[PDB]
């Protein structure tokens, strides 16, 4: 597993830029 992977799969309908402890998500 992977944090950014989890977020990526979650925000499939959007765009998520994972950056270390942060993540940015544009819908």
Number of domains in the chain: 1
Residue 16: which domain range? 1-27
Experimental method: NMR
* Beta carbons of 2 and 9 less than 8 angstroms apart: no
- For 6-11, the CB contacts below 8 A with 24+ separation are none
* Beta carbons of 5 and 18 less than 8 angstroms apart: no
Show Cβ contacts of residue 2 under 8 Å, excluding neighbours closer than 6 positions.
none
The helix or strand, by DSSP H or E, that contains position 22, with its residue range, turns out to be strand 22-26
């Amino acid at each position: 597993n992977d944090a950014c992977k989890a977020l990526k799969a979650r925000y499939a309908g959007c765009e998520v830029r994972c950056d270390x402890p942060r993540y940015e998500v544009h819908c």
